[PDB]
Known about the structure:
By secondary structure, the chain is low in regular secondary structure. It is about 0% helix and about 0% strand. The protein has no helix or strand. It is globular and about 15 Å long.
Amino acid sequence: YVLWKRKRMIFI
């Protein structure tokens, strides 16, 4: 997975 998938980039 990415690194900011938590919420910082909810959309993506």
